[PDB]
Amino acid sequence: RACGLIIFRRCLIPKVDNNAIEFLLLQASDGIHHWTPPKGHVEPGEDDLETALRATQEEAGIEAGQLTIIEGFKRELNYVARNKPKTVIYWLAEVKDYDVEIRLSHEHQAYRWLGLEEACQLAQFKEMKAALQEGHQFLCSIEALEH
């Protein structure tokens, strides 16, 4: 069981920014080099949201002071990969600074910041695509309520 954060940043130059929201995906070092948001396995007695925060620091180098958890969104993914069951729980979090330094561990070899459509295409896997679409939809609905 793993927990992570769908990490996004806002792109606020309307004359040129194609996507007002970009999502962070990390490419795995091993296997077929999947692309996912930051995530990591739970620890005995650790709260699932604290696992997501810790795994984000470990996999992406993003520290808690650099993030803001967006309340109201959570998405649990259950799927089979390589004949093995996987559960991942994601919350949603915004980086404070567009230019936040991404530092990978040995587990990942690259990262991209992408608009929703391209994030979906790179993520490829249907439940991850759904989770990102749903995250984006949630962010738009909040912005409308605040607007």
From Swiss-Prot:
CDD domains: NUDIX_Ap4A_Nudt2. SUPFAM superfamilies: Nudix (SSF55811). Divalent metal ions. It catalyses: P(1),P(4)-bis(5'-guanosyl) tetraphosphate + H2O = GMP + GTP + 2 H(+); a 5'-end CoA-ribonucleoside in mRNA + H2O = a 5'-end phospho-adenosine-phospho-ribonucleoside in mRNA + (R)-4'-phosphopantetheine + 2 H(+); a 5'-end FAD-phospho-ribonucleoside in mRNA + H2O = a 5'-end phospho-adenosine-phospho-ribonucleoside in mRNA + FMN + 2 H(+). Residues 1-136 form the Nudix hydrolase domain. The keyword Nucleotide-binding applies. This is Bis(5'-nucleosyl)-tetraphosphatase [asymmetrical]. The lineage of its organism: Eukaryota, Metazoa, Chordata, Craniata, Vertebrata.
